[PDB]
Design a protein around this motif. Structure first.
Motif, PDB file in Angstrom:
ATOM      1  N   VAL A   1       0.827  -1.197   0.000  1.00  0.00           N
ATOM      2  CA  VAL A   1       0.000   0.000   0.000  1.00  0.00           C
ATOM      3  C   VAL A   1       0.868   1.256   0.000  1.00  0.00           C
ATOM      4  N   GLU A   2       1.861   1.283   0.882  1.00  0.00           N
ATOM      5  CA  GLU A   2       2.749   2.436   1.014  1.00  0.00           C
ATOM      6  C   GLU A   2       3.527   2.721  -0.267  1.00  0.00           C
ATOM      7  N   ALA A   3       4.003   1.667  -0.921  1.00  0.00           N
ATOM      8  CA  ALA A   3       4.733   1.815  -2.177  1.00  0.00           C
ATOM      9  C   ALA A   3       3.838   2.345  -3.303  1.00  0.00           C
ATOM     10  N   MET A   4       2.562   1.961  -3.294  1.00  0.00           N
ATOM     11  CA  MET A   4       1.606   2.437  -4.307  1.00  0.00           C
ATOM     12  C   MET A   4       1.228   3.891  -4.076  1.00  0.00           C
ATOM     13  N   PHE A   5       1.059   4.269  -2.810  1.00  0.00           N
ATOM     14  CA  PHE A   5       0.833   5.675  -2.462  1.00  0.00           C
ATOM     15  C   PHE A   5       2.009   6.532  -2.906  1.00  0.00           C
ATOM     16  N   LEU A   6       3.219   6.023  -2.709  1.00  0.00           N
ATOM     17  CA  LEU A   6       4.413   6.781  -3.046  1.00  0.00           C
ATOM     18  C   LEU A   6       4.537   6.971  -4.555  1.00  0.00           C
TER      19      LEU A   6
ATOM     20  N   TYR B   1      12.549   9.710  -4.677  1.00  0.00           N
ATOM     21  CA  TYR B   1      11.406   8.804  -4.789  1.00  0.00           C
ATOM     22  C   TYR B   1      11.883   7.354  -4.777  1.00  0.00           C
ATOM     23  N   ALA B   2      12.903   7.066  -5.584  1.00  0.00           N
ATOM     24  CA  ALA B   2      13.434   5.708  -5.727  1.00  0.00           C
ATOM     25  C   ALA B   2      13.995   5.148  -4.423  1.00  0.00           C
TER      26      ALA B   2
END
Ligand code: 89P
Lengths: 223, 11
Positions: free
Chosen positions: A79-84, A136-137
Motif C-alpha cells: 500500500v505504502e509503495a503504491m501511495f508513493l 522517490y526511488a
C-alpha cells in the motif's frame, strides 16, 4: 559517494520495470463512471504490484534474505509503495500517468471522503518537497525494506541502512540550505503509514458493495 | 500460503 554504485543500479532498477503504455492509456481512454473507474484502478494496482516485485527483487541482497520474511516485506510495503508511486505521478505530472484523469477516477471509485481528503493532502505535501527521482526511488527502496513489518528484523536493517545513508547524503549534497529536509522526508513516511488503516477500511467498503479484486492483490492485501 | 508472490519472486 564512498560506494554510490548502489545508487546506480537502484535507479537502473527503478527505471527497469515499467507499466505498459497500452494499459495506462485506459486512464485517459475509457468511459468515466464509478464502475469503470474502479476497474481501471484495480488493473493499475495489480500491474503495479508486479512492477513492485521486480523492483524489490533487484534491490541489494533482497534475494539473499529469508524466503518467508521476503513475503512479509512485500505485503507490508504494498500500500505504502503504491501511495508513493501515485504521489510521484501527481507531483511530477508523469505523462503516462494522466494525472488529472487518474484523479477523476480516484475521486469517483467508491472511496469515502474521509479517505480522499488525507490522500490528496498527502500528495500535495509530498509534492511541496520538490523531490528528485532518486529521492522517490530511495524512499521506495527504504519503505520496502522496513524492519518493523509484522512477521528476523536485524538482517533487514543491514539492507536498509545503506539506503538511508545514501538518502541522508543526497539531502546534504542537493539541499545544503535546508538541514531539516531529510527529517522532512522521514516525517512524510509516518504520514504514509496512516494509509494502511485507511486502505483496510477502503477494502472493507468495496467488498461489502460487491467489488472483487485480482488474485495477486487479494494475496498481497490478504483479501 | 502466498503462492503467487513466491512465483513472481522465483521467475
Ligand atoms: C485496487 C484499486 C481499486 C485501488 O485500491 N486502492 C488504491 C489506491 C489509491 Cl486509489 C491511491 C493510492 C494507493 C492505492 Cl493502493 C487503488 C488504485 O491504486 C493505484 C495503484 C497504482 C497506480 C499506478 C502505479 C504506477 C503507474 N505507473 C505509470 C507509468 O507510466 O509508469 C502510470 C500509472 C501508474 C499508476 C495507480 C493507482
Amino acid at each position: 559517494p564512498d560506494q554510490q554504485t548502489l545508487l546506480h543500479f537502484i535507479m537502473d532498477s527503478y527505471n527497469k520495470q515499467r507499466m505498459p503504455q497500452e494499459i495506462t492509456n485506459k486512464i485517459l481512454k475509457e468511459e468515466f463512471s464509478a464502475e469503470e473507474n474502479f476497474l481501471i484502478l484495480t488493473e493499475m494496482a495489480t500491474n503495479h504490484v508486479q512492477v513492485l516485485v521486480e523492483f524489490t527483487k533487484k534491490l541489494p541482497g533482497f534475494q539473499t534474505l529469508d524466503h518467508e520474511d521476503q513475503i512479509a516485506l512485500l505485503k507490508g510495503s504494498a500500500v505504502e509503495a503504491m501511495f508513493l508511486r501515485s504521489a510521484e505521478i501527481f507531483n511530477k505530472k508523469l505523462p503516462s500517468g494522466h494525472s488529472d484523469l487518474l484523479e477523476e477516477r480516484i475521486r469517483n471509485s467508491g472511496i469515502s471522503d474521509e479517505y480522499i481528503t488525507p490522500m490528496f493532502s498527502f500528495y500535495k505535501s509530498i509534492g511541496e518537497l520538490k523531490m528528485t527521482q532518486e529521492e522517490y526511488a530511495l524512499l521506495t527502496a527504504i519503505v520496502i525494506l522496513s524492519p518493523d513489518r509484522q512477521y528476523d528484523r536485524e538482517a533487514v536493517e543491514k539492507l536498509q541502512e545503506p539506503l538511508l545513508d545514501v538518502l541522508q547524503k543526497l539531502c546534504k549534497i542537493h539541499q545544503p540550505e535546508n538541514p531539516q529536509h531529510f527529517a522532512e522526508l522521514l516525517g512524510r513516511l509516518t504520514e504514509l503509514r496512516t494509509f494502511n488503516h485507511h486502505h483496510a477500511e477502503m477494502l472493507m467498503s468495496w467488498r461489502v458493495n460487491d467489488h472483487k479484486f485480482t488474485p495477486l492483490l487479494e494475496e498481497i492485501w490478504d483479501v | 500460503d502466498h503462492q503467487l508472490l513466491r512465483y513472481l519472486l522465483d521467475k
